[PDB]
Amino acid sequence: GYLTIGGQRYQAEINDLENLGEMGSGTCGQVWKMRFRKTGHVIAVKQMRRSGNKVVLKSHDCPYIVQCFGTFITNTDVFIAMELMGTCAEKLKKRMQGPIPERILGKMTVAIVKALYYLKEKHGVIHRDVKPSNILLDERGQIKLCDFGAGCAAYMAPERIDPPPDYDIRADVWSLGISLVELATGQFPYKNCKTDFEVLTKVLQEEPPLLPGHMGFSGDFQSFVKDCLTKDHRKRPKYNKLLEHSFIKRYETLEVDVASWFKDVMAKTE
């Protein structure tokens, strides 16, 4: 807008905000730490990077989506204010230099599925891009989807080069899978590339890079992660069916020290 904050709307302008420092800048535009002088809040603001010629609200109730506060147009940028939050998934894989524990992905899966499920059943949204970059973790445990928009072509389903985008949600389902496998194993499914198309091919060519029976993965997991990576998108699981899979059900209830973990992974590197 306008800046809306639990749960009053204020007007200000990005030049009004006080700026504390940056966070990257590490693709795509300078993301910024800054304080809204009005109320005392400290937020994220992602500067882009105009222009095309010539968003949320209202995902305020869902606790698994990073909350947007408003935007924020100038002649050069496009500023978007978001809740301040730890880090990407993608950057934890690299920072950890090794996989994330099944327990954490299980939490993740739950935060993530319910988000996509939220968006679809409340806003008729089909968020195109489900991937590690878009999954934000935080110091105090929370796990959230950034609704935004080889490598990032790899996450494409089979039926996204077939007989006629899109048909339908099931494509995000796929990207959830690959994200999980990428994430569980700490190694992108297709090590043989890049970059790329010798990727896109493999996908429609070959059978899902399902989870290795080897690394000690609760076959509840292996099961879920496979229901997703179903080639045949037709009988593939809608979000609800995933919501009543067992791997989910476990993880809806099972208590996990996500804060504790994250913090510890902040031991290395820094």
Ligand SMILES: COc1cc(O)c2c(c1)/C=C/C[C@H](O)[C@H](O)C(=O)/C=C/C[C@H](C)OC2=O
């Ligand atoms: C909402 O609070 C945030 C807090 C952050 O620290 C980042 C972002 C948001 C960014 C969201 C959009 C992209 O996910 C991001 O540009 C990216 O690819 C880099 C991820 C690793 C980097 C160090 O962390 C952030 O910058």
